[PDB]
């Protein structure tokens, strides 16, 4: 068990508020990707 | 024959010089007008492409202070 | 004769010029032809 432990780093990692934190940026970029495409859309109309 | 076929091919061969006098004059004038809407083609054209830029350089800020925002 | 050269110089720059121009438009509007692709695969994104 210990030496399973021991070689794989992933596991130990694996063995809160990071993800939460993840999302948001994730979703700001997206939000914002969204904002400049419809301004692009927008302007590029013309 | 050659001679012959070369005689007679000669555009204004059969034609009076006045009337391309005013051909000519009519060519020059559409000429002037034809340049004129290449100005406002072109100016228009630039007038488009820094809308472009300016697209492009609003996007890019975008971007930048995004990416940096976290 | 002087006024036949006239003539054919008139024609050569006059269908060079013409030649030039049209070559502009259809840049110009493959270009703007891109961008519109471009603007739809964008939205598509979204």
């Known amino acids: ?46 | 024959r050659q001679i012959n076929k070369l005689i007679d091919s000669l555009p204004g061969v059969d034609v009076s010089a006045e009337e391309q006098l005013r051909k000519i004059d009519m060519l020059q004038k559409k000429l002037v007008e034809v340049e004129d809407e290449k100005i406002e083609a072109i100016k228009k054209k630039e007038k488009l492409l820094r809308h472009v830029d300016s697209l492009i350089e609003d996007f890019v800020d975008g971007i930048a202070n995004s990416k940096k925002s976290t | 004769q002087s006024r036949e050269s006239l003539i054919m110089l008139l024609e050569e720059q006059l269908e060079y010029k013409r030649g030039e121009i049209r070559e502009i438009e259809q840049v110009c509007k493959q270009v703007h032809d891109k961008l519109t692709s471009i603007q739809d695969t964008l939205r598509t994104g979204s």
């Open chain 1, 1 to 46: 068990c210990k030496s399973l432990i021991s070689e794989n780093e992933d596991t130990k990692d694996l063995l809160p508020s990071e993800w939460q934190d993840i999302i948001h940026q994730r979703e700001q970029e997206l939000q914002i990707k969204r904002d400049v495409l419809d301004d692009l859309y927008r302007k590029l109309q013309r």
